[PDB]
Design a protein around this ligand. Structure first.
Ligand code: ARG
Length: 213
């Protein structure tokens, strides 16, 4: 809780920095982008310093539950399944899943059904993984890091990547060989995850988000 954060002198924020425009590693090795700046605002308003801890996305809730981080600010969708294990702030971004393919491939899937019979790369433990995993006949290939999922697609070892719309746009801008084939397939909102007992921290973060909006 806040007493504990004040006592070490800094907020510990967990994320996976493979997710522009929310968090990524720049060419100097620094972790930057929207969530980083959100983290900084929260810390400044709390009156403490900030430490970002980059890890695998699917390790973030494990890290939060074991108190190795205070909060997750990592483009994380608020889900009923996750609301069983953690608390979320008010939402701060709307997105949904899309399908990315190679422009040179002779296919342009529009729906999850269109990926039946195809090999689809996802980042493990994302809402994208969760969705494609429900469809029998999609062969899912799962990666800790989105960079590796895109390398799989570029190299032709997968047919498609499924991931959130804003990040899909960022990866396709970097990779003119790739294209978003589908419209948006889900209605998701991002929130900041806090341990359920840390009601003080949740409240404070909600107040910061409200002032920002
Ligand atoms: N920093 C990241 N890699 N974030 C992945 C988030 C994907 C999706 N919004 C989810 O919550 O599962």
């Amino acid at each position: 809780a806040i007493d504990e954060i004040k006592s070490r002198g800094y907020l510990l924020v967990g994320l996976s920095a493979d997710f522009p425009p929310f968090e990524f590693v720049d060419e100097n090795g620094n972790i930057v982008a929207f969530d980083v700046d959100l983290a900084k605002e929260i810390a400044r308003r709390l009156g403490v310093e900030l430490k970002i801890v980059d890890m695998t996305f699917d390790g973030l809730i494990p890290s939060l539950l074991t108190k190795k981080i205070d909060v997750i600010i990592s483009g994380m969708t608020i889900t009923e399944e996750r609301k069983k294990v953690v608390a979320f702030s008010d939402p701060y971004f709307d997105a949904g899943q899309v399908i990315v393919v190679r422009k040179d491939s002779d296919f342009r899937p529009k729906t999850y059904e269109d990926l039946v019979g195809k090999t689809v790369a996802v980042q493990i433990g994302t809402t994208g993984d969760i969705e494609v995993s429900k469809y029998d006949g999609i062969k899912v290939v799962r990666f800790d890091k989105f960079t590796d999922a895109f390398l799989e697609l570029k190299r032709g070892r997968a047919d498609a990547v499924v991931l959130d719309s804003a990040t899909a746009r960022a990866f396709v801008a970097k990779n003119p060989d790739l294209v978003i084939s589908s419209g948006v397939l889900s209605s998701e909102q991002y929130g900041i995850a806090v341990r359920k007992e840390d009601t003080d921290l949740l409240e404070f973060i909600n107040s910061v988000l409200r002032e920002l909006k």
